[PDB]
Amino acid sequence: DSELQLVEQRIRSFPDFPTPGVVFRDISPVLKDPASFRAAIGLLARHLKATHGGRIDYIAGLDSRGFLFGPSLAQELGLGCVLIRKRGKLPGPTLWASYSLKAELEIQKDALEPGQRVVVVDDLLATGGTMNAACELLGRLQAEVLECVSLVELTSLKGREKLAPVPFFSLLQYE
Amino acid sequence: DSELQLVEQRIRSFPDFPTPGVVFRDISPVLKDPASFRAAIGLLARHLKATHGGRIDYIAGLDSRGFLFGPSLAQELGLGCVLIRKRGKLPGPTLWASYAELEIQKDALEPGQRVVVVDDLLATGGTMNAACELLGRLQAEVLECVSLVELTSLKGREKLAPVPFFSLLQYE
């Protein structure tokens, strides 16, 4: 897959960041190369249309690296994008949810109406703590989370299991 | 400008946030309405092409609300997007500047490359001024800073001189 290769070629791996023993998979070069970014968005959009047809109402992007992809993916799909932010940033009435990093994500109580169907996007799935918190917040708005997606998944951390029974899809997988 | 109206009509204004007496201009509804987001990006893109022609090499997006616009703006211009983050988030070697601290990878840009910085909102201009400094340390040329919203009574534009500034919408 030439397009998937365009994305994989622009992942930069940094050993021992942020702590010794791990490897940080940096999506920065994907953003810097417009052909790579277009490829990433297209692959995610194509997967989502092939899987949900027209059932998706909104994309939810996760603060902060998910913000890089959410609006472009939403645009490609003809949809709006709603924001899930670190706590303290959003005006009006909010809900929030913890997750070990303790950190907290937040959403405006009026971000979605009950029954609206959403796909959550972030750059990278690791432990799945952040994505889990996002799922909880959306569920508390009585939104239906159709799927969570990322560019990169770290399979040995088993974040995917943690989101079950919500489906997950990543472009690329590393241990 | 009906395109501009599509953006302005989706700004939501919250009094007394984050502190009493200030009005918060919430751009969330612009993102939630795909026609509004498209208009915003289109208006910014057209301004930048009309002003700089082919001179721009990259868009730089400021963490975090700048990340919402920078990639889409870059894509509309056929450009890549480099990232300026809060300190501690980028791997590898970085430069940082305090204003809170911002950070950029040392190889984000090469000397002589020309960049336009984007953020959602210009207030005091502290964040944007720091970003300009960092880019300068890479010997990049900042052509312009742009935002969706500018709060004119805070005189952030004057902080950025002599770098030009452009906003879609202005509020006292």
Side-chain angles (χ1 to χ4, degrees):
Chain A
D1 184 318
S2 190
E3 278 89 42
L4 191 57
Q5 283 171 342
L6 293 176
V7 182
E8 184 162 34
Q9 280 174 358
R10 298 282 178 263
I11 303 300
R12 278 219 300 198
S13 297
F14 291 85
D16 295 343
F17 185 85
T19 49
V22 305
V23 179
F24 180 65
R25 310 293 178 170
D26 181 23
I27 55 60
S28 293
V30 174
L31 276 284
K32 185 170 180 188
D33 174 356
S36 192
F37 184 76
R38 192 147 51 243
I41 295 305
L43 288 162
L44 288 168
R46 193 156 45 232
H47 166 78
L48 288 174
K49 291 190 260 173
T51 302
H52 306 286
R55 290 194 74 231
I56 304 160
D57 292 313
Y58 293 98
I59 302 300
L62 307 194
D63 199 347
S64 181
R65 309 202 204 124
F67 283 7
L68 292 170
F69 297 95
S72 297
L73 178 57
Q75 281 285 294
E76 182 60 21
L77 292 174
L79 300 179
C81 184
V82 297
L83 308 178
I84 297 187
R85 300 225 55 189
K86 299 188 177 87
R87 181 170 177 201
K89 299 297 183 185
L90 289 174
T94 62
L95 301 182
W96 60 85
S98 36
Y99 69 102
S100 205
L101 177 57
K102 297 180 205 136
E104 290 173 309
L105 293 181
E106 191 163 48
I107 199 170
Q108 283 170 326
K109 286 199 196 178
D110 76 348
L112 295 158
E113 289 172 3
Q116 286 188 310
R117 293 174 304 253
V118 172
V119 167
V120 186
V121 60
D122 199 3
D123 68 316
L124 188 149
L125 182 70
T127 62
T130 312
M131 193 67 88
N132 189 238
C135 276
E136 168 188 343
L137 288 169
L138 296 163
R140 287 209 261 145
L141 298 181
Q142 304 178 254
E144 181 178 351
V145 176
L146 299 181
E147 191 164 7
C148 297
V149 304
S150 68
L151 273 80
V152 171
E153 175 189 3
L154 310 174
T155 54
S156 65
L157 294 186
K158 291 171 179 165
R160 169 186 299 266
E161 293 170 20
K162 185 192 267 285
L163 304 171
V166 181
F168 176 73
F169 173 86
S170 61
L171 292 188
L172 298 167
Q173 302 80 36
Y174 304 81
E175 165 160 285
Chain B
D1 197 298
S2 41
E3 291 189 53
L4 187 57
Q5 295 179 329
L6 280 179
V7 182
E8 177 170 13
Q9 284 168 5
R10 294 285 176 245
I11 307 301
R12 252 205 315 202
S13 294
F14 285 89
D16 305 314
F17 190 85
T19 49
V22 304
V23 181
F24 188 82
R25 313 293 174 172
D26 173 25
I27 57 141
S28 297
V30 175
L31 282 282
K32 189 165 175 198
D33 176 356
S36 191
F37 182 76
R38 187 181 42 160
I41 298 298
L43 290 164
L44 286 166
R46 176 159 47 245
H47 164 79
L48 289 173
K49 289 193 276 180
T51 302
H52 300 291
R55 268 190 104 205
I56 312 165
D57 298 321
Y58 294 97
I59 297 307
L62 302 198
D63 202 347
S64 294
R65 285 198 294 250
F67 284 5
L68 287 169
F69 295 94
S72 285
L73 180 54
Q75 277 288 303
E76 181 64 20
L77 295 167
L79 301 183
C81 191
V82 301
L83 307 177
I84 296 172
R85 303 222 48 179
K86 310 321 178 38
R87 196 182 176 200
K89 313 279 195 140
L90 290 174
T94 54
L95 271 301
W96 67 102
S98 33
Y99 61 106
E101 274 179 324
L102 297 180
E103 193 156 52
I104 193 178
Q105 292 176 325
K106 284 208 296 183
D107 49 22
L109 299 165
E110 297 177 30
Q113 295 191 307
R114 300 192 171 119
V115 171
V116 165
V117 185
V118 64
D119 202 1
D120 66 320
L121 180 142
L122 183 70
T124 60
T127 304
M128 189 77 85
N129 195 234
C132 284
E133 175 195 301
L134 276 180
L135 295 166
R137 289 207 179 282
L138 294 187
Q139 306 174 73
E141 172 175 4
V142 180
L143 295 178
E144 196 170 335
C145 299
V146 305
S147 72
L148 274 85
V149 173
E150 167 182 17
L151 310 180
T152 51
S153 77
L154 300 182
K155 302 175 197 326
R157 179 182 294 262
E158 294 175 16
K159 249 202 199 164
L160 299 177
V163 181
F165 176 76
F166 174 82
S167 56
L168 287 185
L169 297 167
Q170 303 81 48
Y171 302 92
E172 199 185 315

